[PDB]
Design a protein around this ligand. Structure first.
Ligand SMILES: Nc1ncnc2c1ncn2[C@@H]1O[C@H](COP(=O)(O)OP(=O)(O)OP(=O)(O)O)[C@@H](O)[C@H]1O
Ligand SMILES: [Mg+2]
Length: 575
């Protein structure tokens, strides 16, 4: 009974994430979406669309080029394809509507997109299924806690993103070596001591900002067990296993150049990014390489990224220190330290492989400044709980003392969006700093539910525009690091468009306005207005803001289309 229900919860959640991709990436842009009732409804039960009083929202009909039609009730007409689905999904061909089981529905829906895109991916289908099955397990494990639990504690926020990226075909697909899911899954409240190795100090590459190289090394691993001339490095336990499978590491181990110390490192909890670890009451997160495909992206820390990390940290310090009047209230997590190791005697390709495997980044643990009970990762902040309801509602109800009315919700949204929009847009147009301020790179800092700061993080996806931001880089920096950092203005702005409005704010708005779709036009209008306010705040010209306020289509990153082919599409402005 808890198991059947957990399965059913995971199937609904999983399917919604898939629809999201279908609508955002195919239906809207290619023009297959209509808010219309089918001519024939045979096959659809009255209860699907009629609640006893009125239609259950608005009919959504998707006519796919292979003659597969989709029917769902939705709560609102949205240009970003953001809406609550208020009915099971119906499919029809030839006719006759059907409600297939999870597996047969996905397959048919995916074959529809395969037919549009003109290419098949059988690997993606298994990944959709494996993703859904892990979500099933996750709800079965977590689905008895109070449902806004994720929102009570930082670590719980990172562990409580049960369903993952809300517009992904397979957000929980993770392909471990044949090692199980639970031991490395945040959603199972995973802890491990980090693997550790003793390594001679001659092969270390250390980047440091405001710290000493020893201080950087200490932040990763306590260094007491290191013998003279050696040091202790850490590594994701799954990574160490993969690392030690390579006969070059076996050689150094046999020849005693390096030492496998065991899982003897600091005991740490993985965060939503899987390869980044949280240690409570420790100054830093630890972010290591993980040669494992997480949501179709191996999380290697390339050598030139380790390099860039350090430059970007340096920049974010100068800008904050000297340029605060033009950073629109920016709050960012520092990445002040970086370690990697390769044998001193190693040639260039071995050298790069070794540092890519041993690469680690220190990220400032903002909880020290902000209090763990006051920081919530934003992705969870606007996600659904074990009971498929937005967590933010009961979360706020508790902090305010009463269920938030329309006006309290609008107030709260205003306090939130300004703190997100100002920093990013000030960085972009004032400095060429392209953030990637999507949900998972963003952390609400709040005081009794009230937004104080929206902390931003992750310097790996921070870029510098060729026309303005680039000039913060020293012309003496290695060309490969420079290439790694450099974005075109249009390239930066497309990413900023997606992340800010589509990935982030659209989700914010949809969660705060569950049960109250009428708020969405009101919240979006406030975003438009807020963009206008930022424009007059700005020290550099911003023709791209003009275009967005005016109503040009918004760039939207793809998570299903890209898998089949393409990386970007365009969705109408919601205002
Ligand atoms: N709304 C969201 N937008 C983008 N990514 C999300 C979202 N929700 C969950 N995620 C997941 O979070 C991870 C973010 O990937 P990213 O590469 O930014 O992290 P990382 O750089 O590997 O680690 P860290 O963020 O700790 O630096 C991905 O696995 C992604 O699928
Ligand atoms: Mg990130």
């Amino acid at each position: 009974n808890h198991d059947v229900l957990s399965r059913m919860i995971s199937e609904k959640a999983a399917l919604h994430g898939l629809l999201n991709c279908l609508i955002k990436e195919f239906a809207i842009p290619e023009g297959y979406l209509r808010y219309e009732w089918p001519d024939e409804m045979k096959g659809i039960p009255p209860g699907a669309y009629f609640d006893g009083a009125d239609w259950k929202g608005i009919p959504m009909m998707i006519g796919l080029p292979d003659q597969l039609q989709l029917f769902v009730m939705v709560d609102r007409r949205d240009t970003f394809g953001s809406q609550h689905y208020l009915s099971d999904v119906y499919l029809r061909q030839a006719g006759d509507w059907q409600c297939p089981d999870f597996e047969p529905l996905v397959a048919r829906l995916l074959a529809a997109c395969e037919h549009i895109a003109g290419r098949k991916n059988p690997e993606l289908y298994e990944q959709i299924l494996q993703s859904q099955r892990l979500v099933s397990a996750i709800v079965s494990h977590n689905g008895r806690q109070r449902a806004d639990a994720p929102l009570q504690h930082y670590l719980q926020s990172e562990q409580g993103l049960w369903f993952g990226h809300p517009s992904h075909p397979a957000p929980k697909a993770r392909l471990w070596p044949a090692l199980g899911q639970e031991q490395w899954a945040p959603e199972f409240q995973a802890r491990a001591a980090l693997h550790q190795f003793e390594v001679p100090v001659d092969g270390l590459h250390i980047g440091a900002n405001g710290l000493t190289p020893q201080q950087v090394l200490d932040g990763f691993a306590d260094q007491q067990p290191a013998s003279p001339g050696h040091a202790i490095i850490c590594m994701h336990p799954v990574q160490a296993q993969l690392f030690m499978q390579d006969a070059r590491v076996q050689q150094l181990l046999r020849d005693n150049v390096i030492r496998d110390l065991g899982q003897s490192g600091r005991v740490a909890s993985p965060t939503a990014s899987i390869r980044t670890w949280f240690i409570d009451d420790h100054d830093y997160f630890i972010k290591g390489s993980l040669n494992v495909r997480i949501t179709n992206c191996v999380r290697k820390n390339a050598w030139y990224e380790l390099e860039s990390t350090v430059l970007i940290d340096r920049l974010f310090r100068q800008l904050l220190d000297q340029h605060a009047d033009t950073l629109g209230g920016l709050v960012a997590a520092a990445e002040p330290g970086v370690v990697s190791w390769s044998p001193a005697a190693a040639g260039e390709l071995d050298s790069h492989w070794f540092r890519e495997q041993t690469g680690g980044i220190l990220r400032e643990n903002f909880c020290r400044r902000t209090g763990a009970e006051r920081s919530i990762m934003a992705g969870t902040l606007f996600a659904r709980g074990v009971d498929l309801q937005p967590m933010i509602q009961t979360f706020l109800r508790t902090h305010y003392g009463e269920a938030l009315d329309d006006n309290a919700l609008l107030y709260w949204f205003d306090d939130y969006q300004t703190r997100l929009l100002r920093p990013v847009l000030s960085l972009f147009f004032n400095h060429g700093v392209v953030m990637e301020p999507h949900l998972q790179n963003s952390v609400l800092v709040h005081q009794q539910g009230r937004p104080q700061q929206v902390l931003l993080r992750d310097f790996e996806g921070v870029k510098l525009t060729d026309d303005l931001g680039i000039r913060y880089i020293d012309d003496d920096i290695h060309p490969r690091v420079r290439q790694s950092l450099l974005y075109s203005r249009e390239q930066g702005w497309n990413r900023i468009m997606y992340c800010l409005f589509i990935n982030h704010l659209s989700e914010t708005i949809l969660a705060l306005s569950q049960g109250r779709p009428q708020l969405a036009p009101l919240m979006w209008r406030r975003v438009q207005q807020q963009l206008r306010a930022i424009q007059g705040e700005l020290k550099q010209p911003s023709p791209e803001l003009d275009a967005l306020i005016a109503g040009h289509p918004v760039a939207c990153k793809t998570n299903l289309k890209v898998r089949l082919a393409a990386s970007y599409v365009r969705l109408p402005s919601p205002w």
